[PDB]
Amino acid sequence: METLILTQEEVESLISMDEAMNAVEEAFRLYALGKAQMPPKVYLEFEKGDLRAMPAHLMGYAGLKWVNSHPGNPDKGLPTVMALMILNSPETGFPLAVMDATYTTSLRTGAAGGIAAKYLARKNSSVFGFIGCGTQAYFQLEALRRVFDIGEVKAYDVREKAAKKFVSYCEDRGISASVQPAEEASRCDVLVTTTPSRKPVVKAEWVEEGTHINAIGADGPGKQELDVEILKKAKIVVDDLEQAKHGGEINVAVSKGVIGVEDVHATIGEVIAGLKDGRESDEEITIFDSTGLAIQDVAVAKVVYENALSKNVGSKIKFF
Amino acid sequence: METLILTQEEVESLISMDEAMNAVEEAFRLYALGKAQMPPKVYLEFEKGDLRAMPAHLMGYAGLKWVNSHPGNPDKGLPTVMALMILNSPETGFPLAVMDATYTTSLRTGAAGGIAAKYLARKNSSVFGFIGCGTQAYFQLEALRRVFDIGEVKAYDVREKAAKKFVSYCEDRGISASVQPAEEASRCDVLVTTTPSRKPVVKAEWVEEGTHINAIGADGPGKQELDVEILKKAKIVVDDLEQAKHGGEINVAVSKGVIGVEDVHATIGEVIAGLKDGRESDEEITIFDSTGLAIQDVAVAKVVYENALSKNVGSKIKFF
Ligand SMILES: NC(=O)c1ccc[n+]([C@@H]2O[C@H](COP(=O)([O-])OP(=O)(O)OC[C@H]3O[C@@H](n4cnc5c(N)ncnc54)[C@H](O)[C@@H]3O)[C@@H](O)[C@H]2O)c1
Ligand SMILES: NC(=O)c1ccc[n+]([C@@H]2O[C@H](COP(=O)([O-])OP(=O)(O)OC[C@H]3O[C@@H](n4cnc5c(N)ncnc54)[C@H](O)[C@@H]3O)[C@@H](O)[C@H]2O)c1
Ligand code: NA
Ligand code: NA
């Protein structure tokens, strides 16, 4: 028996943002129809960071992603986030592959952002605002242009160097774009928040009617990027109800009792599956609360694995 | 940097049974003292088997063992049980090694049996009987050999050649061993139950006083190996309370309501750390209910990992 070993460089050449988008969309659809299995994430907290286990079964595969988050890592000489995915066969339990999931974690988060805006944002969106111009912002930008012709990009980062680079990246591919303060960047049709802040970075009075917000940054207890008043006034569509409660953009609000569960309109899978309506009026403010789900990592790993067999990419180890 | 890769053949040459028994004994102690973290197991159920995630943090390492069980695997050209352990630095979260845990899982279970008996059986034990003779019997046997001085060995199983595959293996290294059905094997100083049964296979009657029993088989909600009565009459010492009342030897009697918390004497880690006593009478019956802990897998992976670094064994992959 042979287990395929895939490196980050290899995995990067094995999936398309479009492939990632199709896989993530079907994953949401399947989970909402009960055709996917996914236990809650498991945390192992450390003093300098943590590790999380994210197992899932769907589309004919099973797998477990084991990701860490150590902030002091860069100030040290290593990425903050490193992830490994073990892909298995549901019929034999055999470990078909051990791959880098560092890149695909960013990729499939980008893909989800793009799929959520496709279903929730006004069909006429053209102005895209970005609060935070780090790695994830680029992936969100790339997924979104698969679904919208981007008229204008307004970019804000506390690190001006990062906003200018993102702006320059846009122009390079012909997208009109400019660096902008936070209040102005927030004025748009689709607003992508991608910061790891623990206090509001976007004010309610800055958000106009009809805005769709991809709230991506918040993913751990206490993380929070939005003025809670925005939450009260919006149709909130989460990733996974329980993961949003614990660490999504809505965690602080729910914990401090500002909004309840009736305040959550649907999960993105329910909308995609037709179990709940998505955007219903032009005036409403919509929010997609993204936390990252194991079904997205397995779906996407399935594509990397099959494309890997096809191109004879990888190396092999006989573990047993 | 790189991640060390270790095959089952390599791991087998990197850890001795004595190291495993010391690693495991210390893992139980440390955890009883709150010096280790271990969240519950996470399951993924499939039509023909399952996969479980077992993460733990102790001894300066963190790791996740991802292991399956597909009963129809042998008659398909695969072992029923295969497992991989990703071992990590709690400091940077970096995955130091991805190694086989198929062999060690067996090793660390025998080791546990060996440590439990060392603390719970008559210090004069010399007659051992086995109810199973399958893979695990071999590891319990090999571990018990490092603790007590054997003389005779009573061995039974619902197959006969296996009692033979076992008896001669047992004879070959120097201990008089004979096949002897349930009733016969059942009386000894140490009884080692290693079967996947679903209803008692050992009757209250059959067991003499002063017997220490390693109840190793009961692995899930369904099975039991002992006649509930034996329970009502013994020093019951568990692995982890939560896991045993869920799927260990006590889960049925507990689910039926016959025994409860109050009836479990202690955690094996508690006896080792001396927070609870062990045998206190030559007569009393003592049972070690084993379910298998992640902390045992991580504790054993640390030994494999350090010996591998020390002997320059293993291949390397640059995942990122
Ligand atoms: N939901 C998911 O599935 C998912 C997937 C990937 C990452 N994440 C989360 O995304 C964030 C990281 O995105 P990344 O990988 O690009 O990280 P990064 O550090 O490269 O990007 C974050 C950017 O935010 C900017 N920033 C920080 N504070 C700010 C503030 N107060 N206002 C404006 N800009 C600010 C930084 O200067 C940086 O350029 C974290 O919160 C992380 O945990 C979630
Ligand atoms: N608690 C723990 O730490 C731990 C660790 C590993 C395995 N397990 C459990 O070990 C058990 C089997 O070990 P393995 O996977 O090495 O096994 P195996 O299949 O290699 O051996 C089990 C043996 O039990 C015999 N057997 C089956 N039913 C019996 C019955 N009713 N009466 C008498 N003998 C019977 C079989 O013929 C077989 O030889 C399973 O229940 C498994 O879930 C528990
Ligand atoms: Na957020
Ligand atoms: Na048992």
mmCIF file of C-alpha atoms in Angstrom, chain B residues 23-295:
data_model
loop_
_atom_site.group_PDB
_atom_site.id
_atom_site.type_symbol
_atom_site.label_atom_id
_atom_site.label_comp_id
_atom_site.label_asym_id
_atom_site.label_seq_id
_atom_site.Cartn_x
_atom_site.Cartn_y
_atom_site.Cartn_z
ATOM 1 C CA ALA B 23 6.305 6.332 28.808
ATOM 2 C CA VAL B 24 2.761 5.066 29.447
ATOM 3 C CA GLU B 25 3.119 4.801 33.219
ATOM 4 C CA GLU B 26 4.360 8.376 33.318
ATOM 5 C CA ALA B 27 1.574 9.521 30.943
ATOM 6 C CA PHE B 28 -1.105 8.175 33.334
ATOM 7 C CA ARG B 29 0.589 9.790 36.343
ATOM 8 C CA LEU B 30 1.077 13.168 34.693
ATOM 9 C CA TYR B 31 -2.541 13.268 33.555
ATOM 10 C CA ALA B 32 -3.854 12.330 36.993
ATOM 11 C CA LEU B 33 -1.896 15.291 38.290
ATOM 12 C CA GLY B 34 -3.355 17.596 35.664
ATOM 13 C CA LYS B 35 -0.032 17.882 33.786
ATOM 14 C CA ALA B 36 -1.501 16.729 30.480
ATOM 15 C CA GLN B 37 -4.372 17.647 28.218
ATOM 16 C CA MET B 38 -6.588 15.241 26.433
ATOM 17 C CA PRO B 39 -9.939 16.053 24.969
ATOM 18 C CA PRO B 40 -12.485 13.331 24.134
ATOM 19 C CA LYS B 41 -12.087 11.168 20.996
ATOM 20 C CA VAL B 42 -13.771 12.317 17.792
ATOM 21 C CA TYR B 43 -15.421 9.780 15.516
ATOM 22 C CA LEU B 44 -16.348 9.583 11.887
ATOM 23 C CA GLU B 45 -18.679 6.613 11.319
ATOM 24 C CA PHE B 46 -18.799 4.823 7.987
ATOM 25 C CA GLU B 47 -20.902 2.020 6.655
ATOM 26 C CA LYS B 48 -17.990 -0.434 6.983
ATOM 27 C CA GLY B 49 -15.906 1.001 9.857
ATOM 28 C CA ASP B 50 -14.767 4.336 11.306
ATOM 29 C CA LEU B 51 -11.896 6.757 11.909
ATOM 30 C CA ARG B 52 -11.053 8.467 15.155
ATOM 31 C CA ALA B 53 -9.050 11.518 16.028
ATOM 32 C CA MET B 54 -7.096 11.256 19.294
ATOM 33 C CA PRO B 55 -5.169 14.410 20.240
ATOM 34 C CA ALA B 56 -3.129 14.941 23.412
ATOM 35 C CA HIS B 57 -0.571 17.365 24.900
ATOM 36 C CA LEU B 58 2.045 16.254 27.471
ATOM 37 C CA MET B 59 5.753 15.828 28.109
ATOM 38 C CA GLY B 60 6.488 18.841 25.965
ATOM 39 C CA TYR B 61 4.811 17.489 22.795
ATOM 40 C CA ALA B 62 1.401 17.641 21.195
ATOM 41 C CA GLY B 63 0.112 15.209 18.627
ATOM 42 C CA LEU B 64 -2.903 13.772 16.904
ATOM 43 C CA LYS B 65 -3.292 10.109 16.084
ATOM 44 C CA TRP B 66 -5.791 9.508 13.256
ATOM 45 C CA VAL B 67 -6.842 5.815 13.323
ATOM 46 C CA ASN B 68 -9.490 3.644 11.617
ATOM 47 C CA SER B 69 -11.168 0.261 12.095
ATOM 48 C CA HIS B 70 -12.709 -1.524 9.099
ATOM 49 C CA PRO B 71 -13.481 -5.170 10.113
ATOM 50 C CA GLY B 72 -13.840 -6.296 6.513
ATOM 51 C CA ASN B 73 -10.318 -5.167 5.682
ATOM 52 C CA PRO B 74 -8.235 -8.368 6.184
ATOM 53 C CA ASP B 75 -10.449 -10.371 3.884
ATOM 54 C CA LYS B 76 -9.618 -7.602 1.433
ATOM 55 C CA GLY B 77 -5.831 -7.488 1.715
ATOM 56 C CA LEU B 78 -5.488 -4.827 4.437
ATOM 57 C CA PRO B 79 -5.114 -4.785 8.211
ATOM 58 C CA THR B 80 -8.315 -3.822 10.016
ATOM 59 C CA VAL B 81 -6.375 -1.167 11.900
ATOM 60 C CA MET B 82 -3.932 1.355 10.422
ATOM 61 C CA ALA B 83 -2.890 4.589 12.083
ATOM 62 C CA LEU B 84 -0.848 7.758 11.609
ATOM 63 C CA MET B 85 0.416 10.094 14.292
ATOM 64 C CA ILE B 86 1.375 13.700 13.472
ATOM 65 C CA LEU B 87 3.673 14.837 16.293
ATOM 66 C CA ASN B 88 4.110 18.600 16.914
ATOM 67 C CA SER B 89 6.045 21.221 18.865
ATOM 68 C CA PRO B 90 3.658 23.001 21.290
ATOM 69 C CA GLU B 91 5.923 26.027 20.982
ATOM 70 C CA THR B 92 5.726 26.684 17.228
ATOM 71 C CA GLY B 93 2.988 24.177 16.348
ATOM 72 C CA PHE B 94 5.343 22.770 13.702
ATOM 73 C CA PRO B 95 4.657 19.104 12.708
ATOM 74 C CA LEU B 96 7.958 17.513 13.668
ATOM 75 C CA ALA B 97 7.014 14.061 12.397
ATOM 76 C CA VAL B 98 4.283 12.041 10.682
ATOM 77 C CA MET B 99 4.777 8.421 11.749
ATOM 78 C CA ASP B 100 3.107 5.069 11.797
ATOM 79 C CA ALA B 101 1.103 4.480 14.976
ATOM 80 C CA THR B 102 -0.324 1.051 13.941
ATOM 81 C CA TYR B 103 2.472 -0.824 15.736
ATOM 82 C CA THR B 104 2.710 1.584 18.756
ATOM 83 C CA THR B 105 -1.031 1.572 19.415
ATOM 84 C CA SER B 106 -0.690 -2.133 20.028
ATOM 85 C CA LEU B 107 2.554 -1.566 21.990
ATOM 86 C CA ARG B 108 1.189 1.128 24.272
ATOM 87 C CA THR B 109 -1.938 -1.019 25.066
ATOM 88 C CA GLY B 110 0.161 -4.003 26.094
ATOM 89 C CA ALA B 111 2.354 -1.608 28.071
ATOM 90 C CA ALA B 112 -0.703 -0.228 29.850
ATOM 91 C CA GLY B 113 -1.870 -3.771 30.674
ATOM 92 C CA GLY B 114 1.592 -4.415 31.983
ATOM 93 C CA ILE B 115 1.577 -1.303 34.224
ATOM 94 C CA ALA B 116 -1.952 -1.830 35.464
ATOM 95 C CA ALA B 117 -1.096 -5.376 36.577
ATOM 96 C CA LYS B 118 2.113 -4.135 38.156
ATOM 97 C CA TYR B 119 0.008 -1.929 40.464
ATOM 98 C CA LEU B 120 -3.069 -4.101 40.848
ATOM 99 C CA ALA B 121 -2.242 -7.820 40.762
ATOM 100 C CA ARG B 122 -0.927 -10.043 43.553
ATOM 101 C CA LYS B 123 2.797 -9.376 43.861
ATOM 102 C CA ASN B 124 3.052 -13.197 43.774
ATOM 103 C CA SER B 125 1.178 -13.662 40.505
ATOM 104 C CA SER B 126 2.615 -16.419 38.328
ATOM 105 C CA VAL B 127 -0.320 -18.121 36.561
ATOM 106 C CA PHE B 128 -1.698 -16.181 33.616
ATOM 107 C CA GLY B 129 -4.691 -17.010 31.468
ATOM 108 C CA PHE B 130 -5.680 -15.400 28.161
ATOM 109 C CA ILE B 131 -9.134 -15.058 26.621
ATOM 110 C CA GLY B 132 -8.418 -14.108 23.000
ATOM 111 C CA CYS B 133 -4.971 -15.019 21.653
ATOM 112 C CA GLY B 134 -5.325 -12.377 18.941
ATOM 113 C CA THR B 135 -2.834 -9.559 18.259
ATOM 114 C CA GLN B 136 -3.331 -7.786 21.582
ATOM 115 C CA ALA B 137 -2.754 -10.968 23.623
ATOM 116 C CA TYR B 138 0.787 -10.990 22.342
ATOM 117 C CA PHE B 139 1.505 -7.443 23.549
ATOM 118 C CA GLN B 140 -0.106 -7.926 26.972
ATOM 119 C CA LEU B 141 1.929 -11.122 27.338
ATOM 120 C CA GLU B 142 5.190 -9.492 26.271
ATOM 121 C CA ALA B 143 4.554 -6.603 28.697
ATOM 122 C CA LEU B 144 3.536 -8.833 31.641
ATOM 123 C CA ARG B 145 6.871 -10.669 31.137
ATOM 124 C CA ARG B 146 8.764 -7.505 32.139
ATOM 125 C CA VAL B 147 6.769 -7.295 35.362
ATOM 126 C CA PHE B 148 6.053 -10.711 36.915
ATOM 127 C CA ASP B 149 7.892 -14.019 36.657
ATOM 128 C CA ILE B 150 5.672 -16.489 34.801
ATOM 129 C CA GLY B 151 5.571 -20.295 35.045
ATOM 130 C CA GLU B 152 2.445 -21.523 33.258
ATOM 131 C CA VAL B 153 0.023 -19.769 30.884
ATOM 132 C CA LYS B 154 -3.595 -20.822 30.299
ATOM 133 C CA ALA B 155 -4.814 -19.891 26.805
ATOM 134 C CA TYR B 156 -8.266 -20.027 25.143
ATOM 135 C CA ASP B 157 -10.079 -18.646 22.076
ATOM 136 C CA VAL B 158 -13.158 -19.261 19.875
ATOM 137 C CA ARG B 159 -10.782 -20.630 17.236
ATOM 138 C CA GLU B 160 -8.210 -23.325 18.007
ATOM 139 C CA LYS B 161 -5.213 -22.824 15.745
ATOM 140 C CA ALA B 162 -4.842 -19.322 17.258
ATOM 141 C CA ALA B 163 -4.553 -20.793 20.752
ATOM 142 C CA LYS B 164 -1.911 -22.826 18.957
ATOM 143 C CA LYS B 165 -0.437 -19.929 16.951
ATOM 144 C CA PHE B 166 -0.141 -18.481 20.478
ATOM 145 C CA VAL B 167 0.808 -21.420 22.694
ATOM 146 C CA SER B 168 3.886 -22.379 20.671
ATOM 147 C CA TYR B 169 4.923 -18.720 20.279
ATOM 148 C CA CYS B 170 4.578 -18.704 24.065
ATOM 149 C CA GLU B 171 6.431 -21.996 24.453
ATOM 150 C CA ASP B 172 9.145 -20.974 21.976
ATOM 151 C CA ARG B 173 10.450 -18.266 24.277
ATOM 152 C CA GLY B 174 10.232 -20.197 27.527
ATOM 153 C CA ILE B 175 7.011 -20.382 29.526
ATOM 154 C CA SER B 176 4.922 -23.555 29.780
ATOM 155 C CA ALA B 177 1.729 -22.723 27.883
ATOM 156 C CA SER B 178 -1.309 -24.910 27.167
ATOM 157 C CA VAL B 179 -4.606 -24.383 25.389
ATOM 158 C CA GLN B 180 -7.482 -24.573 27.901
ATOM 159 C CA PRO B 181 -11.070 -23.397 27.200
ATOM 160 C CA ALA B 182 -12.821 -20.435 28.833
ATOM 161 C CA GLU B 183 -13.610 -22.067 32.193
ATOM 162 C CA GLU B 184 -10.051 -23.349 32.541
ATOM 163 C CA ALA B 185 -8.126 -20.293 31.391
ATOM 164 C CA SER B 186 -10.416 -18.119 33.511
ATOM 165 C CA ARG B 187 -8.759 -19.053 36.819
ATOM 166 C CA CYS B 188 -5.373 -17.479 37.346
ATOM 167 C CA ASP B 189 -3.505 -14.733 39.158
ATOM 168 C CA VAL B 190 -3.859 -12.547 36.082
ATOM 169 C CA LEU B 191 -6.608 -12.935 33.492
ATOM 170 C CA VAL B 192 -6.116 -10.906 30.288
ATOM 171 C CA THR B 193 -9.345 -10.434 28.323
ATOM 172 C CA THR B 194 -8.699 -9.348 24.763
ATOM 173 C CA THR B 195 -11.852 -10.044 22.729
ATOM 174 C CA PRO B 196 -14.283 -7.825 20.695
ATOM 175 C CA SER B 197 -17.310 -9.697 22.093
ATOM 176 C CA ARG B 198 -20.756 -8.133 22.833
ATOM 177 C CA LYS B 199 -21.900 -10.274 25.848
ATOM 178 C CA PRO B 200 -19.992 -11.746 28.834
ATOM 179 C CA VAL B 201 -17.477 -14.416 27.852
ATOM 180 C CA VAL B 202 -16.308 -14.823 31.424
ATOM 181 C CA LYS B 203 -18.817 -15.905 34.063
ATOM 182 C CA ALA B 204 -18.742 -14.651 37.662
ATOM 183 C CA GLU B 205 -18.475 -18.278 38.792
ATOM 184 C CA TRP B 206 -15.370 -19.098 36.714
ATOM 185 C CA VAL B 207 -13.214 -16.561 38.580
ATOM 186 C CA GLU B 208 -11.310 -17.370 41.764
ATOM 187 C CA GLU B 209 -10.546 -14.785 44.443
ATOM 188 C CA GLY B 210 -7.299 -12.800 44.356
ATOM 189 C CA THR B 211 -7.538 -12.461 40.588
ATOM 190 C CA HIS B 212 -6.465 -9.329 38.734
ATOM 191 C CA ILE B 213 -8.150 -8.912 35.353
ATOM 192 C CA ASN B 214 -6.984 -6.857 32.360
ATOM 193 C CA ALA B 215 -10.264 -6.038 30.616
ATOM 194 C CA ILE B 216 -8.660 -4.902 27.328
ATOM 195 C CA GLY B 217 -11.279 -5.769 24.658
ATOM 196 C CA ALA B 218 -14.334 -3.578 25.449
ATOM 197 C CA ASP B 219 -13.678 -0.827 22.938
ATOM 198 C CA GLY B 220 -17.117 0.733 22.265
ATOM 199 C CA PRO B 221 -20.787 1.279 23.380
ATOM 200 C CA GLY B 222 -21.808 -2.251 22.440
ATOM 201 C CA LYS B 223 -19.315 -4.752 23.996
ATOM 202 C CA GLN B 224 -18.449 -6.218 27.336
ATOM 203 C CA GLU B 225 -16.325 -9.256 28.146
ATOM 204 C CA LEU B 226 -17.069 -9.824 31.799
ATOM 205 C CA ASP B 227 -20.177 -11.088 33.578
ATOM 206 C CA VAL B 228 -21.556 -7.907 35.133
ATOM 207 C CA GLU B 229 -21.456 -9.711 38.476
ATOM 208 C CA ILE B 230 -17.684 -9.872 38.416
ATOM 209 C CA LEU B 231 -17.984 -6.117 38.326
ATOM 210 C CA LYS B 232 -20.189 -5.859 41.431
ATOM 211 C CA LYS B 233 -17.499 -7.806 43.265
ATOM 212 C CA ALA B 234 -14.221 -6.162 42.177
ATOM 213 C CA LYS B 235 -11.683 -3.319 42.624
ATOM 214 C CA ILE B 236 -12.625 -1.522 39.419
ATOM 215 C CA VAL B 237 -9.829 0.661 38.079
ATOM 216 C CA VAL B 238 -10.293 2.655 34.903
ATOM 217 C CA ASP B 239 -8.329 4.269 32.064
ATOM 218 C CA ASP B 240 -10.332 7.392 31.850
ATOM 219 C CA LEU B 241 -13.730 7.361 33.564
ATOM 220 C CA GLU B 242 -15.559 9.218 30.842
ATOM 221 C CA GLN B 243 -14.288 6.839 28.092
ATOM 222 C CA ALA B 244 -15.009 3.586 29.955
ATOM 223 C CA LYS B 245 -18.577 4.310 30.997
ATOM 224 C CA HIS B 246 -18.967 5.164 27.295
ATOM 225 C CA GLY B 247 -17.329 2.141 25.674
ATOM 226 C CA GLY B 248 -15.041 0.341 28.097
ATOM 227 C CA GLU B 249 -15.838 -2.681 30.239
ATOM 228 C CA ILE B 250 -18.193 -0.724 32.481
ATOM 229 C CA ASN B 251 -20.328 1.049 29.802
ATOM 230 C CA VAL B 252 -23.148 -1.568 29.725
ATOM 231 C CA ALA B 253 -23.627 -2.048 33.494
ATOM 232 C CA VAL B 254 -23.472 1.734 33.728
ATOM 233 C CA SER B 255 -25.918 2.241 30.846
ATOM 234 C CA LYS B 256 -28.252 -0.371 32.305
ATOM 235 C CA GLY B 257 -27.851 1.531 35.583
ATOM 236 C CA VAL B 258 -26.373 -1.340 37.614
ATOM 237 C CA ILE B 259 -23.090 0.459 38.431
ATOM 238 C CA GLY B 260 -22.203 4.115 38.454
ATOM 239 C CA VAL B 261 -19.495 6.571 39.377
ATOM 240 C CA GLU B 262 -19.519 5.562 43.043
ATOM 241 C CA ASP B 263 -18.644 2.014 41.989
ATOM 242 C CA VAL B 264 -15.398 2.749 40.148
ATOM 243 C CA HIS B 265 -12.489 2.620 42.576
ATOM 244 C CA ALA B 266 -10.118 4.807 40.646
ATOM 245 C CA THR B 267 -8.321 5.927 37.546
ATOM 246 C CA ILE B 268 -5.080 3.941 36.911
ATOM 247 C CA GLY B 269 -3.234 7.258 36.823
ATOM 248 C CA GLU B 270 -4.656 7.909 40.283
ATOM 249 C CA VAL B 271 -3.180 4.716 41.719
ATOM 250 C CA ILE B 272 0.208 5.424 40.149
ATOM 251 C CA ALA B 273 0.294 9.001 41.474
ATOM 252 C CA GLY B 274 -0.897 7.501 44.740
ATOM 253 C CA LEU B 275 -4.088 9.555 44.970
ATOM 254 C CA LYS B 276 -5.992 6.231 45.331
ATOM 255 C CA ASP B 277 -4.850 2.842 46.631
ATOM 256 C CA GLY B 278 -4.560 -0.417 44.718
ATOM 257 C CA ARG B 279 -4.748 -4.023 45.946
ATOM 258 C CA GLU B 280 -5.255 -4.042 49.720
ATOM 259 C CA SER B 281 -6.251 -7.692 50.171
ATOM 260 C CA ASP B 282 -4.894 -10.981 48.808
ATOM 261 C CA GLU B 283 -8.511 -12.055 48.259
ATOM 262 C CA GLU B 284 -10.162 -9.125 46.461
ATOM 263 C CA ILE B 285 -10.637 -9.189 42.688
ATOM 264 C CA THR B 286 -9.179 -6.255 40.721
ATOM 265 C CA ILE B 287 -10.009 -5.135 37.232
ATOM 266 C CA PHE B 288 -8.236 -2.653 34.977
ATOM 267 C CA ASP B 289 -10.745 -1.346 32.440
ATOM 268 C CA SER B 290 -8.716 -0.203 29.423
ATOM 269 C CA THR B 291 -10.080 1.930 26.563
ATOM 270 C CA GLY B 292 -6.898 3.495 25.221
ATOM 271 C CA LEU B 293 -5.785 7.094 25.723
ATOM 272 C CA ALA B 294 -4.269 9.618 23.299
ATOM 273 C CA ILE B 295 -1.789 10.589 26.009
#
